[PDB]
Amino acid sequence: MKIFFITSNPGKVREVANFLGTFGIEIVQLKHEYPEIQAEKLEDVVDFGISWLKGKVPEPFMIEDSGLFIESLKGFPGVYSSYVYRTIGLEGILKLMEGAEDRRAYFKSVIGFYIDGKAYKFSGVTWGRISNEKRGTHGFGYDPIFIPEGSEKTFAEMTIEEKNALSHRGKALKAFFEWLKVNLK
Amino acid sequence: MKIFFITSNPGKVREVANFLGTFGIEIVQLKHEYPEIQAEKLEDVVDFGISWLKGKVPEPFMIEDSGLFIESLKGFPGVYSSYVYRTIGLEGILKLMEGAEDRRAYFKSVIGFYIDGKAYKFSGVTWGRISNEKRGTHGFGYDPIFIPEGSEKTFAEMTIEEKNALSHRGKALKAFFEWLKVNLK
Numbered sequence: 001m002k003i004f005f006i007t008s009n010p011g012k013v014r015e016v017a018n019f020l021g022t023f024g025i026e027i028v029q030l031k032h033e034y035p036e037i038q039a040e041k042l043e044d045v046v047d048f049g050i051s052w053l054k055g056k057v058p059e060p061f062m063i064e065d066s067g068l069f070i071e072s073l074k075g076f077p078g079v080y081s082s083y084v085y086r087t088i089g090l091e092g093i094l095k096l097m098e099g100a101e102d103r104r105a106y107f108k109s110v111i112g113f114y115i116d117g118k119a120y121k122f123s124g125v126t127w128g129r130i131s132n133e134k135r136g137t138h139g140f141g142y143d144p145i146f147i148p149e150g151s152e153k154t155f156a157e158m159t160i161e162e163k164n165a166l167s168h169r170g171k172a173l174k175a176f177f178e179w180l181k182v183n184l185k
Numbered sequence: 186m187k188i189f190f191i192t193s194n195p196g197k198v199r200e201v202a203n204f205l206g207t208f209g210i211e212i213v214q215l216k217h218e219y220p221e222i223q224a225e226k227l228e229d230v231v232d233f234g235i236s237w238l239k240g241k242v243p244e245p246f247m248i249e250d251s252g253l254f255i256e257s258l259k260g261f262p263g264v265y266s267s268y269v270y271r272t273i274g275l276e277g278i279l280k281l282m283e284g285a286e287d288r289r290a291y292f293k294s295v296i297g298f299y300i301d302g303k304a305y306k307f308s309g310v311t312w313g314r315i316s317n318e319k320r321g322t323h324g325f326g327y328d329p330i331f332i333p334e335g336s337e338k339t340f341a342e343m344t345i346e347e348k349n350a351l352s353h354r355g356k357a358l359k360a361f362f363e364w365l366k367v368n369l370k
């Protein structure tokens with residue numbers, strides 16, 4: 001089965017394609033910019049995005065919104081993880097966390113899926129902590145400073161398969177796939 | 186003349202009302218939430234906002250998008266000044282600026298105006314620097330840590346009239362008013 005993935009993030013595509021491909025699902029990236037509203041919830045961005053995209057792209061399609069939420073920073077950078085990464089970057093996050101007792105944080109991914117006039121959402125969350133040093137060359141974004149719960153390595157020190165087995169995106173993808181098997185034989 | 190101001194920020198209303206009121210223009214706040222897209226330019230948020238709002242609110246109306254752009258932080262928090270204020274707050278900005286040589290930054294305001302099926306934009310910019318200490322009880326948001334070029338006081342240490350005479354919003358309002366006098370006798 002083929003599914004179009006509207007996104008400008010090649011990192012997400014690789015991870016999504018590598019996971020669903022093992023089950024016979026082909027992911028095709030579609031660089032179709034769509035309005036990503038400011039909001040407090042990733043879910044809200046996904047809802048508006050799908051409503052705007054329907055009728056403008058091949059079906060069935062999917063989009064994804066995700067972010068890093070840091071407890072000591074009240075959830076920041078969250079929904080605006082991309083902008084924050086491009087401006088203050090990883091060094092800016094480390095700077096903000098200097099002297100922070102609680103370095104806990106979580107990555108969350110919300111996948112939006114549209115087919116036959118209906119939208120579906122699948123989410124995944126992975127808790128962890130912000131490292132004091134960035135390590136790793138894999139992945140993208142905040143991977144160099146995020147170590148998932150129960151691991152010694154940051155996401156950047158893992159391969160796609162390894163990250164997918166632990167990440168927020170992997171969890172959302174698993175829920176998504178399961179839904180596909182049952183609804184979409 | 187009456188103009189509806191779609192905004193949820195009472196601080197903006199006070200400043201806008203106090204400035205235009207002196208010229209016989211009555212500002213009425215309208216709490217009508219509208220999609221404020223993520224974007225790199227304040228202008229883009231305003232353009233999309235007006236397109237979404239037309240036909241849903243009384244006319245003529247206006248909206249405004251603004252932010253604080255810090256040079257050493259590559260423009261951050263910019264368009265997402267509101268979210269950043271509510272999360273890391275003023276302390277988060279000061280933390281990020283610790284040891285910063287260049288504390289330069291500017292506030293920018295973009296006013297969007299709609300009348301008779303046409304949208305108009307007016308902008309204003311005020312340069313200054315981020316203080317090391319927050320001072321003042323006036324204004325709102327980042328006012329306690331922003332001192333405009335040519336002044337010793339932060340925005341929070343000024344009155345509405347004083348701030349308006351120097352701020353980004355005051356400059357956008359002046360351009361807006363001038364346009365009103367000529368086009369909208």
Ligand SMILES: O=P(O)(O)OP(=O)(O)OP(=O)(O)OC[C@H]1O[C@@H](n2cnc3c(O)ncnc32)[C@H](O)[C@@H]1O
Nearest residue numbers: 007008009064065066067081082085140141142143
């Ligand atoms: O909107 P699309 O086109 O899908 O691309 P995007 O990546 O710019 O938009 P996102 O709004 O979903 O960006 C959230 C940010 O969250 C970050 N992020 C998400 N998943 C991540 C992961 O597994 N590792 C590191 N950073 C991640 C990353 O910096 C992103 O740019």
Ligand SMILES: O=P(O)(O)OP(=O)(O)OP(=O)(O)OC[C@H]1O[C@@H](n2cnc3c(O)ncnc32)[C@H](O)[C@@H]1O
Nearest residue numbers: 192193194249250251252266267270325326327328
């Ligand atoms: O969208 P509306 O409903 O108009 O309300 P808002 O204030 O939440 O939305 P803005 O997107 O325009 O917010 C930008 C932020 O820029 C900040 N800001 C703008 N003008 C300012 C000023 O004169 N002094 C201090 N902070 C200011 C302030 O923190 C705002 O919340």
Ligand code: NA
Nearest residue numbers: 036064065066
């Ligand atoms: Na997204």
Ligand code: NA
Nearest residue numbers: 221249250251
């Ligand atoms: Na606004």
